Amino acid sequence: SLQPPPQQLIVQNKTIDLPAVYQLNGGEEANPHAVKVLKELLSGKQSSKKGMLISIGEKGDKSVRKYSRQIPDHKEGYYLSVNEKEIVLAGNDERGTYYALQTFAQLLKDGKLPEVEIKDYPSVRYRGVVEGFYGTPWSHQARLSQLKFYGKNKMNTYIYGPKDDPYHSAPNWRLPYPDKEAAQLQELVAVANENEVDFVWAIHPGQDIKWNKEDRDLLLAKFEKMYQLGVRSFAVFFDDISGEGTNPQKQAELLNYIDEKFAQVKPDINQLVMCPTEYNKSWSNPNGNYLTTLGDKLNPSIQIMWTGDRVISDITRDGISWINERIKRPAYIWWNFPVSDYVRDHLLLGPVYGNDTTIAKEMSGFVTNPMEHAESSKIAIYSVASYAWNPAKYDTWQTWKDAIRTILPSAAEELESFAMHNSDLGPNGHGYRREESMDIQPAAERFLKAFKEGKNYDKADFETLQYTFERMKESADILLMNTENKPLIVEITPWVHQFKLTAEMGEEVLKMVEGRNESYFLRKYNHVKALQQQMFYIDQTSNQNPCQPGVKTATRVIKPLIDRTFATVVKFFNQKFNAHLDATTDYMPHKMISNVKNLPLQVKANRVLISPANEVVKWAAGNSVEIELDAIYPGENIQINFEISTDGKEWKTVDLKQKERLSAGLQKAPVKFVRFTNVSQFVLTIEK
Numbered sequence: 194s195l196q197p198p199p200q201q202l203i204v205q206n207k208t209i210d211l212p213a214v215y216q217l218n219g220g221e222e223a224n225p226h227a228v229k230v231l232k233e234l235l236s237g238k239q240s241s242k243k244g245m246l247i248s249i250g251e252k253g254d255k256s257v258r259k260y261s262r263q264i265p266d267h268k269e270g271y272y273l274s275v276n277e278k279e280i281v282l283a284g285n286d287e288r289g290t291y292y293a294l295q296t297f298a299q300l301l302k303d304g305k306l307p308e309v310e311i312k313d314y315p316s317v318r319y320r321g322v323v324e325g326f327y328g329t330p331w332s333h334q335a336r337l338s339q340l341k342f343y344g345k346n347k348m349n350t351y352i353y354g355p356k357d358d359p360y361h362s363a364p365n366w367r368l369p370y371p372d373k374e375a376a377q378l379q380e381l382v383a384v385a386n387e388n389e390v391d392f393v394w395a396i397h398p399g400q401d402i403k404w405n406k407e408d409r410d411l412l413l414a415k416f417e418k419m420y421q422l423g424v425r426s427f428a429v430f431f432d433d434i435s436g437e438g439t440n441p442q443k444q445a446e447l448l449n450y451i452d453e454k455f456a457q458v459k460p461d462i463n464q465l466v467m468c469p470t471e472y473n474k475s476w477s478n479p480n481g482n483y484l485t486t487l488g489d490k491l492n493p494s495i496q497i498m499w500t501g502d503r504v505i506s507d508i509t510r511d512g513i514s515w516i517n518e519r520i521k522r523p524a525y526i527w528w529n530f531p532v533s534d535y536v537r538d539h540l541l542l543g544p545v546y547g548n549d550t551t552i553a554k555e556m557s558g559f560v561t562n563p564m565e566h567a568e569s570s571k572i573a574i575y576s577v578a579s580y581a582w583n584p585a586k587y588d589t590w591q592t593w594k595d596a597i598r599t600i601l602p603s604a605a606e607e608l609e610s611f612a613m614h615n616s617d618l619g620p621n622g623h624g625y626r627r628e629e630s631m632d633i634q635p636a637a638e639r640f641l642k643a644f645k646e647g648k649n650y651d652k653a654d655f656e657t658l659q660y661t662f663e664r665m666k667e668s669a670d671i672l673l674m675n676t677e678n679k680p681l682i683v684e685i686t687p688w689v690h691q692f693k694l695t696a697e698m699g700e701e702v703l704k705m706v707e708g709r710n711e712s713y714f715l716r717k718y719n720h721v722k723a724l725q726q727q728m729f730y731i732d733q734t735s736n737q738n739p740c741q742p743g744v745k746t747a748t749r750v751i752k753p754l755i756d757r758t759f760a761t762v763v764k765f766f767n768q769k770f771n772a773h774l775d776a777t778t779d780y781m782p783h784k785m786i787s788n789v790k791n792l793p794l795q796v797k798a799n800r801v802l803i804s805p806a807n808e809v810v811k812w813a814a815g816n817s818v819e820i821e822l823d824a825i826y827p828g829e830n831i832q833i834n835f836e837i838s839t840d841g842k843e844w845k846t847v848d849l850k851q852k853e854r855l856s857a858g859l860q861k862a863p864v865k866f867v868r869f870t871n872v873s874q875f876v877l878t879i880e881k
């Protein structure tokens with residue numbers, strides 16, 4: 194299906210052959226980036242004075258004079274027509290002609306075109322991506338590929354602002370990029386121009402900015418150096434900072450100075466954008482004038498960014514009305530999905546949904562903050578492009594599938610099968626969740642309800658679970674060997690391994706449920722235990738980032754089903770045969786006995802810890818919490834917030850410091866046991 198869907202479309206159910214012999218009118222006067230696409234689509238066909246007429250141009254060109262009343266009078270609009278006698282590709286402006294050609298390219302199938310007439314233009318003026326996350330910035334190659342992808346989906350905006358780029362942010366925002374990075378940025382700009390994308394270079398100076406002449410001038414000089422590299426759009430971000438940089442008068446004055454002294458002196462600057470310090474409703478001070486001050490003081494052509502009612506949120510009619518009244522202009526949305534920089538152990542490959550589809554006139558722009566996995570983010574980015582171009586016709590589910598089919602034609606079903614179970618974020622501090630595994634959830638819930646209570650589970654439900662696990666393994670194995678988009682596969686691989694293991698575990702657990710004899714059960718139980726260990730090894734060796742290390746997959750429905758089923762069936766087996774099989778679901782090589790306590794230990798990088806508790810705690814009469822590691826290690830430190838040994842019996846005390854935060858270095862002392870008993874979090878850090 195055409196993506197994004199045109200504003201107006203009339204199809205005739207004739208079809209016509211892309212002309213073998215054609216006559217091209219407007220090649221020397223239309224957008225050269227449009228003419229280039231057209232000639233690629235027409236190579237091997239004969240350009241000659243006789244034959245089918247193709248007319249390409251912008252309003253004002255000689256080539257499309259006949260069609261000027263058909264051309265929408267909208268920025269980035271176009272008119273496209275195909276019939277028996279002629280083809281017309283006509284923009285309101287140069288970018289419109291390029292976009293005509295991106296629609297044309299999707300219409301052409303097996304050298305044939307439908308007889309069609311289209312009038313199209315975007316509902317939202319600025320549409321795109323802000324690489325504005327924390328973590329590993331996108332590679333240069335990833336970015337080249339992104340920019341072509343934006344062009345094909347009529348996204349006109351790429352805002353460059355990776356938080357970990359030292360020349361964008363703290364500390365080196367005052368310095369020009371080194372030669373190597375500068376030549377790369379220059380190449381990005383050329384490629385963005387060829388795909389009709391505005392490269393917006395942002396700067397994040399607010400953590401140590403001084404409100405003086407010197408820093409003002411250095412900021413302009415940096416902007417000037419970026420102008421030399423080809424940049425024609427600019428932004429200044431004041432997000433996630435404290436101190437003097439948060440002053441709204443000074444922010445507005447700086448932005449206004451940049452406008453008057455730089456954006457108004459150059460012949461050719463397009464966007465000028467700021468992001469505020471209070472960038473969502475729940476974070477704006479009620480007893481405060483931060484947003485009204487920006488609203489009143491900031492020059493009216495300067496955009497202001499906004500994430501919604503919370504840091505992570507979907508955009509509502511009431512929410513956008515709320516911010517527009519204060520900032521006095523339509524908000525430029527920074528939408529925090531599929532960004533995963535706060536749940537880095539998850540991929541977010543689900544559909545794009547939750548945003549009101551009737552508020553196009555209430556937003557200046559709409560951009561998505563994506564994951565650090567660039568190719569993976571294309572599912573959401575394609576969807577956002579469709580949303581923001583034509584929100585009234587926005588179909589979440591269909592666009593999700595179209596995206597998957599574009600990104601991985603050779604294995605789209607397998608990719609969809611993986612993504613359906615890799616959508617949710619798990620629990621997080623922002624409270625933001627997404628649907629996952631919704632097709633199997635019914636059967637999952639019934640099966641488990643029965644099985645726990647005492648009744649027979651429905652056999653179709655059991656088979657649906659089997660079906661699922663089988664299909665999961667097919668998709669994992671096919672995906673891992675796919676070479677049509679190697680960069681995608683490299684990104685998702687650790688999660689593909691973990692997903693396969695989840696599926697294998699699921700199958701073995703269902704064979705425990707069918708429970709032929711005693712020794713079959715035990716073989717299956719041992720196989721599960723080994724798969725649990727394998728999952729632990731992936732979780733400790735893959736994606737070892739400093740925030741949320743490891744790899745979690747199918748967490749919403751599938752892993753809890755499997756874990757709860759295993760626990761249940763192991764309990765029934767213990768009851769039946771008077772045995773003592775361990776029913777725990779996650780492999781943990783360290784042990785933790787106590788009197789108080791059913792908190793599972795966790796391993797994160799070189800940290801061994803107890804899971805933070807809830808039921809506030811009963812502790813008296815020499816009661817102890819003993820942790821035994823699986824070997825002796827050099828101890829770095831311990832940290833606790835409301836004794837050691839290698840031996841078991843031979844103990845030495847440690848004295849904790851105090852800041853409300855108890856903590857003591859162990860200066861590489863050998864440690865295997867750690868014990869605590871009543872006096873005056875819980876994290877041992879070791880050398881790995």
Ligand SMILES: *CCC(=O)Nc1nc(OCC)c2ccccc2n1
Pocket residue numbers: 327328433534535739740
């Ligand atoms: C481990 C996180 C990282 O790479 N850096 C970082 N992250 C965050 O939040 C990530 C969600 C952050 C917030 C405020 C200030 C600095 C920060 N640094």
Ligand SMILES: CCNC1=N[C@@H]2[C@@H](O)[C@H](O)[C@@H](CO)O[C@@H]2S1
Pocket residue numbers: 325326327356432433468469472498499500504527529532534535562
């Ligand atoms: C104008 C909004 N700016 C924001 N800055 C931060 C981003 O860099 C993070 O990626 C995001 C989610 O962790 O949270 C905030 S939203």
Ligand SMILES: [Ca+2]
Pocket residue numbers: 222223224250251254
């Ligand atoms: Ca022209």
